[PDB]
């Protein structure tokens, strides 16, 4: 199949101690531009960094003094990491990502609900939940009898589910008058045409 | 540093005593997969991504070997300065809209450091699914814990979090 490639963490020459390594690939306009950054963290103290915008291992603390100076000497290490912008970043983006994350499209599930039990001519609230969609770009708008109602509309922030799906709730302050038609509008890049779910008074 | 998409490839976390490690792959906040370090097999978050891509689980075991090595060297280079604990915090919410009859409950713990957390007032575990530690900009971690449940008025649920930064455990009711 396609190959996910990981960077080559360069090596160094009751208490608890934690070490961490990173390999961040910042893509803009596709592969039109890429910025590669590697980070070495010891006890939440980032001490050594390589930034493709620099082109040389730099010391982030006094602890980075040796490791930065050392990794810059041996070119078998520097030229390797420097070139990881193509072997790890560009490769992963143009290869495995396109066949997975950059291809995932999940349409949302739209359901309207009354938070308080319906009492005609008494004020109540409508809630248009929008769940299970990827990516994150989504616009939800509320219509009352064919009129964009932006007043009394409060939408939660984007919610990360952690399994490549999101969630958004958009509450609407309203009062049910008989005959009224409340519709929830959902526009998403995974929808050929906007989804419209109605709720009759 | 903004950009359109961000790939957090090659996350290598190790800590001793305990020889605890982790090797994961993230892209836009969500995790592509981790590598099981005791089974030596890549475990994908989405099974669909498994059939579409591949990653040699051996491309990590070695990285963690490098990370175990650098940690031992750095612990001595600082005269053995221990890591500072950090108080975690949790927020519990359901994945799909909770209709009282099908659904799963998610506990989102953040500000975890060091990465050692233990996630009807009774021990329950139907189809629990925990994830590997996600990286934060402040180099602490966050982790999610799904729970498969069916809601009823008589039944309320909680999320227990055991951490060294907490003098005593805490729980968030829902």
């Amino acid at each position, epitope marked *: 199949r396609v*190959s996910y*490639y*990981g960077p*080559k963490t360069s*090596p160094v020459q009751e208490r608890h101690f934690v070490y961490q390594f990173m390999g961040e690939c910042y893509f803009t306009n596709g592969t039109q531009r890429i910025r590669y950054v590697t980070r070495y963290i010891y006890n939440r103290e980032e001490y050594v960094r390589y930034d493709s915008d620099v082109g040389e291992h730099r010391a982030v603390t006094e602890l980075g003094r040796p490791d930065a100076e050392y990794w810059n000497s041996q070119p*078998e290490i520097l030229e*390797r990491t420097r070139a990881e912008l193509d*072997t*790890v970043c560009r*490769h992963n983006y143009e290869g495995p990502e396109t066949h997975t994350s950059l291809r995932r499209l999940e349409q949302p599930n739209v359901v309207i609900s009354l938070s308080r039990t319906e009492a005609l001519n008494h004020h109540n609230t409508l809630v248009c939940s929008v769940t299970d969609f990827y990516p994150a770009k989504i616009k939800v708008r509320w219509f009352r009898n064919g009129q964009e109602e932006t007043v009394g509309v409060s939408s939660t922030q984007l919610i990360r589910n952690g399994d490549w799906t999101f969630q958004v709730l958009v509450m609407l302050e309203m009062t049910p008058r008989r005959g009224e038609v409340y519709t929830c509008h959902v526009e998403h890049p995974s929808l050929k045409s906007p989804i419209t779910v109605e709720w009759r008074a | 540093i903004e950009a359109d998409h961000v790939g957090t490839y090659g996350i290598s976390v190790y800590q001793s005593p305990g*020889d605890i490690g982790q090797y994961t792959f993230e892209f836009d906040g969500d995790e592509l997969f981790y590598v099981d370090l005791d089974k*030596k097999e890549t475990v994908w978050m989405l099974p669909e991504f498994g059939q579409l891509a591949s990653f*040699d689980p*051996q*491309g*990590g*075991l*070695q*990285n963690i*070997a*490098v990370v*175990k*090595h650098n940690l031992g060297v750095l612990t001595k280079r600082s005269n053995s300065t221990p890591a500072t604990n950090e108080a975690p915090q949790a927020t519990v919410f359901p994945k799909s809209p909770v209709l009282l009859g099908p659904n799963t409950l998610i506990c989102f713990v953040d500000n975890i450091f060091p990465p050692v957390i233990n996630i009807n007032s009774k021990s329950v575990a139907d189809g629990v699914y925990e994830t590997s530690f996600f990286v934060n900009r402040d180099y602490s971690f966050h982790k999610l814990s799904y729970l498969t449940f069916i809601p009823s008025d008589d039944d309320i649920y909680d999320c227990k979090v055991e951490h060294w930064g907490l003098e005593e455990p805490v729980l968030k009711h829902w």
Partner: T-cell receptor, first 111, second 113 residues
Framework: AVTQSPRNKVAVTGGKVTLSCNQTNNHNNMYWYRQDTGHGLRLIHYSYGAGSTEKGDIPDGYKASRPSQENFSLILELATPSQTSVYFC???????????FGAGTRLSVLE | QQVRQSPQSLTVWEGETAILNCSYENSAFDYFPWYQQFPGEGPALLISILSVSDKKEDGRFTIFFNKREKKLSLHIADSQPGDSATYFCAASETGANTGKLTFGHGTILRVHP
């Protein structure tokens, strides 16, 4: 360099045979290969560092042990006549381009 | 995945060129070291080549790489009898950070005096 030990051993089927290997190159990776006619060099076990051993392509019958960064050792718990071959030890740095091999061990498992 | 080397053994007369070939299946291979093993001792690196280049020439030994057909060829010139040995052809996918090398079965060289 890399010095395997012993360089020649004769053993009986069913006994325990423990080949050993030491290195003075400050390497991190060590491997155990067996050479056979018509099958080339085959990987049995390898180790990225002290404490961990990773299986190779033919790990059946052998056990590995990496107690030191300098020492790697095979272990034939239950020897069989199918094991007789010339065994080789190697090592290389992380992301190590080159492989530094041992001199070789001639094993003879007889009934 | 597998790697093949043909012929299984070769015999060349002194002062003339030996040609040892090697072919690989996995298109992701990019590092191609060659290990020379004399009787009685282990193998040692002789000459390597990366998929970027088509040939690295090291005096008497030259490798010719073909990314298209996924084929290789080692050329030993003015071969002396001190070259009679076994020549392995290895290939690793460096991007995969495996550590594994996956050798070929190796050709056997015989230099006629």
């Amino acid at each position: 360099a890399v010095t395997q030990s012993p360089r020649n051993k004769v053993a009986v089927t069913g006994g325990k045979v423990t080949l050993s290997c030491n290195q003075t190159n400050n390497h991190n990776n060590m491997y155990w290969y067996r050479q056979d006619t018509g099958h080339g060099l085959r990987l049995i076990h390898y180790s990225y560092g002290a404490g961990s051993t990773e299986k190779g392509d033919i790990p059946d019958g052998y056990k590995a042990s990496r107690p030191s960064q300098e020492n790697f050792s095979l272990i034939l718990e239950l020897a069989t006549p199918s094991q007789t071959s010339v065994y080789f030890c190697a090592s290389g740095d992380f992301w190590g381009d080159t492989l530094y091999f041992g001199a070789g061990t001639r094993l003879s498992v007889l009934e | 995945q597998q790697v093949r080397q043909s012929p299984q053994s070769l015999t060349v007369w002194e002062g003339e060129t030996a040609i040892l070939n090697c072919s690989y299946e996995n298109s992701a291979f990019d590092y191609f070291p060659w290990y020379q093993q004399f009787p009685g001792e282990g193998p040692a690196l002789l000459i390597s080549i990366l998929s970027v280049s088509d040939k690295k020439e090291d005096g008497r030994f030259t490798i010719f790489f073909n990314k298209r057909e996924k084929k290789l060829s080692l050329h030993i010139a003015d071969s002396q009898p001190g070259d009679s040995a076994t020549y392995f052809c290895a290939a690793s996918e460096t991007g995969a950070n495996t550590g594994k090398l996956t050798f070929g079965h190796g050709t056997i060289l015989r230099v006629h005096p």
